[PDB]
Ligand binder design. Structure first.
Ligand code: HEM
Ligand SMILES: CCOC(=O)c1cc2cc(-c3ccncc3)ccc2n1CC1CCCCC1
Length: 409
């Protein structure tokens, strides 16, 4: 029924290198909110099961996220697209990080790692991130023009991870280098990167950091993570290393692409940009995340038969939650295609559907976004784009590689 091209794959990186398949996502919400996306032989992005169920409705995304007992993140990982020829064991490597664990293993890890995302712990970063956000902005304005991504979006998200982990200043340069080589392998601009090499360098440094803190324990997030709680629970040295590797991407290109596409949206909607500069509403962060949806989609795997909204899902089959579609569901949003930074409440799923795996760094991201746009307004309120943004070739990330901008006008 649904009017779609033969051979169409919603995880095809060819599409996302050009555009977002908004019209195609809308077609399914009307004609087939849960639609079997078949994949030709050898074109499964690393999965040889023949296709997956596209999930386009927000309520369906929420049901899958909260029914993590049926819909597993471990079985096949949550990334729904790699290079088609990727070895299976390269996919299973994901299972070493919390994102791709099921309960009970995931439950133990999440509980320990929560010590580093308490509201207090994130608040201690406000002043330092505000200071840097202002300086980044001032630095870019002085340049007159350049790559908005590298000059505005790139650094601060990484400074949040470093500050959260108490990484020494002199170490941050190489730490950022490694973190930025973790994803984007499919884009021709980054074909030469080896995410496996830089990850090993990341774990080696993180494990090194963990054994030093045990011998010289101070008050910071790293020490609380490697010390036994009242329950005797804590992160082993390697578990802390897989924690760092997870942050290096989970809080890197996600927050970055939200800053970029957030500024892109402000350029598209001058009314909203004048409004922001005057009142600086912090509800803008959630609207920027909904508008940007930096993670286009994560997948799950059904461990048993499951009926979801009148559609039979069979054990072993993959379901791909398309957050880019759920965040523009006409059923839950009044004018989903209206950029409204005052939108309140705003139940977007850019941080995922509520449930076990809901982004632990959601509020840190919100604060990063708010601090940097306040700085953009303070230091370059009349910036205008020079050329169209350059999109990233990815099957699940909605990335912006470059964006030329004039900060003077
Ligand atoms: C705009 C910024 C961000 C977006 C769009 C985003 C998106 C997401 C999504 C969709 C998930 C999976 C949710 C699910 O499976 O139900 C997730 C999980 C996660 N995020 Fe984020 N995230 C952002 C920022 C951050 C930051 C700044 C950090 C840390 C510094 C972070 C750390 C994590 C971690 C550790 C997980 C795994 C949680 C688990 O598996 O239990 N994220 N994020
Ligand atoms: C020992 C584990 O370390 C890794 O190898 C690794 C972890 C990881 C996590 C994310 C990630 C993505 C999104 N949201 C949060 C996290 C993306 C890529 C990742 N990789 C590299 C990649 C190399 C080979 C194929 C899969 C893994």
């Amino acid at each position: 029924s649904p009017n779609l091209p033969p051979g169409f794959d919603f995880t095809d990186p060819a599409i996302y290198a050009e555009r977002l398949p908004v019209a195609e996502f809308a077609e399914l919400r009307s004609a087939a909110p849960i639609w079997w996306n078949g994949q030709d032989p050898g074109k499964g992005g690393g999965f040889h099961d023949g296709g997956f169920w596209a999930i386009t409705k927000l309520n369906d995304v929420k049901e899958i996220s909260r029914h993590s007992d049926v819909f597993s993140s471990y079985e096949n990982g949550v990334i729904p697209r790699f290079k088609n020829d990727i070895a299976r064991e390269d996919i299973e490597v994901q299972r070493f990080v919390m994102l791709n664990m099921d309960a009970p293993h995931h439950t133990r890890l999440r509980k320990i790692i929560s010590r580093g995302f308490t509201p207090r712990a994130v608040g201690r970063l406000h002043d330092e991130l505000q200071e840097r956000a202002q300086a980044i902005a001032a630095e870019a304005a002085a340049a007159g023009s350049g790559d908005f991504v590298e000059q505005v979006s790139c650094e601060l998200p990484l400074q949040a991870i470093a500050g959260l982990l108490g990484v020494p200043q002199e170490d941050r340069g190489k730490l950022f280098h490694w973190s930025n080589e973790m994803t984007g392998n499919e884009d021709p601009e980054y074909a030469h990167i080896d995410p496996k090499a830089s990850s090993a360098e990341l774990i080696g440094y993180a494990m090194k950091m963990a054994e030093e803190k045990a011998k010289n324990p101070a008050d910071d997030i790293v020490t609380q993570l490697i010390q036994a709680d009242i329950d005797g629970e804590k992160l082993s040295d390697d578990e802390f290393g897989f924690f760092v590797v997870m942050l290096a991407v989970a809080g890197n290109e996600t927050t970055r692409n939200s800053i970029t596409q957030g500024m892109m949206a402000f350029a598209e909607h001058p009314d909203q940009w004048e409004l922001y500069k005057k009142v600086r509403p912090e509800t803008a962060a959630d609207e920027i995340v909904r508008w940007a949806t930096p993670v286009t989609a994560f997948q799950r795997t059904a461990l048993r038969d499951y009926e979801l909204s009148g559609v039979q899902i069979a054990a072993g089959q993959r379901v791909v939650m398309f957050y880019r579609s759920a965040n523009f569901d006409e059923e839950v949003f009044q004018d989903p295609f209206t950029f409204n930074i005052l939108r309140n409440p705003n139940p977007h799923v850019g941080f995922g559907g509520t449930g076990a795996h809901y982004c632990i760094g959601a509020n840190l991201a919100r604060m990063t976004i708010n601090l940097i746009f306040n700085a953009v307004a303070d230091h370059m309120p009349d910036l205008k784009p020079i050329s169209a943004p350059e999109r990233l070739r990815s099957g699940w990330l909605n990335g912006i590689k470059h964006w030329q901008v004039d900060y003077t006008g």
